[model samples]
Target: YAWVLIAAYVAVFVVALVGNTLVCLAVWRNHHMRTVTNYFLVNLSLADVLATAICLPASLLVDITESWLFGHALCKVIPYLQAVSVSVAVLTLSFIALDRWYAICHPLLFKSTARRALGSILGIWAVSLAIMVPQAAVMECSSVLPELAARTRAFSVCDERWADDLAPKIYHSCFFIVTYLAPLGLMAMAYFQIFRKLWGRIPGTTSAEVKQMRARRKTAKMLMVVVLVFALCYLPISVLNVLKRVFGMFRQASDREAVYAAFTFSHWLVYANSAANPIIYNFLSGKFREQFKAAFSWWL
Candidate 1:
């Protein structure tokens, strides 16, 4: 069982690191492809790389050990950092959505200049920090199941629910809702409207309307890919979480184990989402794929 998990972790990490790094390098080096969309890809790459590095390796340790052995400071500090990386990543995706929304829906009114694109990215960072900071301060770093571990040390663990004067369940539940569910809902709505615009643009659509058609078509495809990936990865996990929250009080061993298995499956799938965004751009965008290939050969 341990070896199986180790192998899985290694495989996921290897693929995620290589794929996202290539996407970042290709975008960063390909000057012609350097634009507003690519800027978001850069942010996506950086955020994922950091998350994979800082958040995931430790997680693998916890997974293999089925324990939180990393002391108290890490317990407090690490979860916040995880939250920060997550906030940046999700917000970056939202920014990418908005960028496409503007480029396709409001071309004339959309900010065309390079400075504006840079400013928009900076603005995302600002908002991301604003959202992540509170969680950072209040992040519950304790082991969710400290007693199950081989060595149980109350002081060394960073279990959020264990903290005094803090409501850890509320924290986790709220974080799940705001950071995961709410943002996911917004993404769905944005993509749906974007798709609506594209589908509505067919027959009597003017030249400007034709342009919107072309623009929205590509953007819709990309956004659909994003949303689908998000759904594919997140939906199961989200459902399972809701189930656990609702049924946790009635915990039976078999029931908990089933939930655990589902959680495990969804966790891997959802994490794969974190690594999917950068690669998806290349997969969907021919321009990107060609430019990425050109940049790769240029390096070689």
Candidate 2:
């Protein structure tokens, strides 16, 4: 039974690692894919690669043992790495949305460049690292003993060990607002304006111009789906995290198990997003699909 659990983790690890690697290759191997936006894709793949490499294996080990086996230092370090990677990944995606918005809404004024993308990518990591400092500082290796049980019966855990009562709550709220809500709000506003621009026709536009506009609009629609998937992946976990803060520990054993199970599944879904993006790109973007085919024709 435990082997099956381990196998499931291996599947996630392999998919995320391999899928993101292929995405990087797709961009790097094809000169045509070397757009400013694809530069961000390359960065996004690297972030997912970090998550898959460091985070997934560490988490899988904890899941299998049902305890924290890696020592005290690791308990802090691994989650920090995971948080940084995930934060980078999310912010990079948001910037990708920003790029699209600019391209669609202010085409004459906006241009995407490798240099600009690289600078922003560096800034993304910097901001993410700064944001995660508190998380790494406060997290510690502890144990959770349900029903006030003995240490022997307790589950060894790696989680935040905030000094004050309000700190954890404040941290969670701030993190959610900064990383999740801010990007979501910007993307929503951007896409809404873009949608209006697409349908709001100009009187002087020719048929050729209308056709080009349609193509760009379709691309926007695809990217919008990507953003929607990001929301779907993280929203459940974010909501549950808030619930955990508000409700505190579950009193009933059955209730605890159910809630915990849901919470755990929601997290795995977030990781699944790291793996799923390449598949989505393959499906939605014809250029991506063609380039992926060209890159991996040996497999075929």
Candidate 3:
């Protein structure tokens, strides 16, 4: 069981780090890949890289040991940065969908440039950092068994320590809506319009025009899948959080193992998403596949 868990996390760690790095490198080295949409993708990859590199090991250790081995400072820093990365990813996807919507649906109304995309990337990080401050603030480290606190840090746990009983419930409820539900709903609507615009219409007369339309359709399809996967990957954890935090379920000793299993799986799924994006890109986008191959050839 330990080996299995370790292998799963290690696989995600390797894939997420290498794949996201390749994505950024691909965009950097190949000018042709530097479109407005690709810039958002690079930003997304950066968030994945951040989560995988800084957050994953801590999560794995905590899950496996059932204790927070890292000290008070990292307990705050790691989860805070993890939440920031999640926000960055969510906002980046929304921006990508909005950019695609404007490009395909209302071409003349909005023009998306690489510079504008870069500016938006900055805005994404700024908002993510600022918005996640409360997360950092609420985090507290203490021993799981209070009596053992002085003896060793082995039994310590890092968790949200809210002043009031209702604070966590309210905060996590708001977090669920803003980070998961709202952006996903907007992206779904935007992509629905995009799908209709691209696939609903008849083919163009010229071959070149038809090819351009085909390319746009493919890109939109790829992005839609990415968003769909994000929603699916996050659903379990979101639901679990609502149940645990909002409704205060699973408090009994009998439910401890079941809760642990559920949470362990859900947490792994969340990290799996960081790795999944690059695989999705490689499969869905021909350009990304080619670039991935090119990047791999460097070591070969």
Highest TM-score among the candidates is held by which one?
Answer: 3
Candidate 2 local lDDT, 103-138, one digit each (tens):
778888867888899999999999988889887898
Top of the candidates by lDDT: 3
Each candidate structure's TM-score, on Cα atoms with residue i matched to residue i, is: 0.79, 0.88, 0.96
Clashes of each: 5, 0, 0
lDDT of each: 0.68, 0.79, 0.92
Query: For residues 1-300, could you state the per-residue lDDT of candidate 1 as single tens digits?
Result: 667867776777776787687777766776766777677767767777776777777677665555566776676666666676667767777777777777656667767555676787787677766777665565455545656454664333444443542354555578678767887788788777777767663356578767746765875787678766876776786666555553344267767656556666666675577667756877888766786577568767
Q: After superposition, how far is residue 34 of candidate 1 from its true place, in Å?
A: 1.5
The list of candidate 3 runs beyond 4 A from truth reads 202-209
Sort by lDDT, top down from the best: 3, 2, 1
Give the higher-lDDT candidate: 1 or 2: 2
Q: After aligning candidate 2 to the native by TM-score, how far in Å is the CA of 256 from where it should be? A: 2.8
Per residue, candidate 3 scores C-alpha lDDT tens digits across 127-187 of: 9999999999999999868999888888999999888889989999999999999999999
Q: Quote the positional error of residue 106 for candidate 3 in Å.
A: 1.5
| lDDT, residue 62, candidate 3 | 84
In model 1, how large is the Cα lDDT of residue 104?
58
RMSD to the true structure for each prediction, in A, is 4.2, 3.5, 1.5
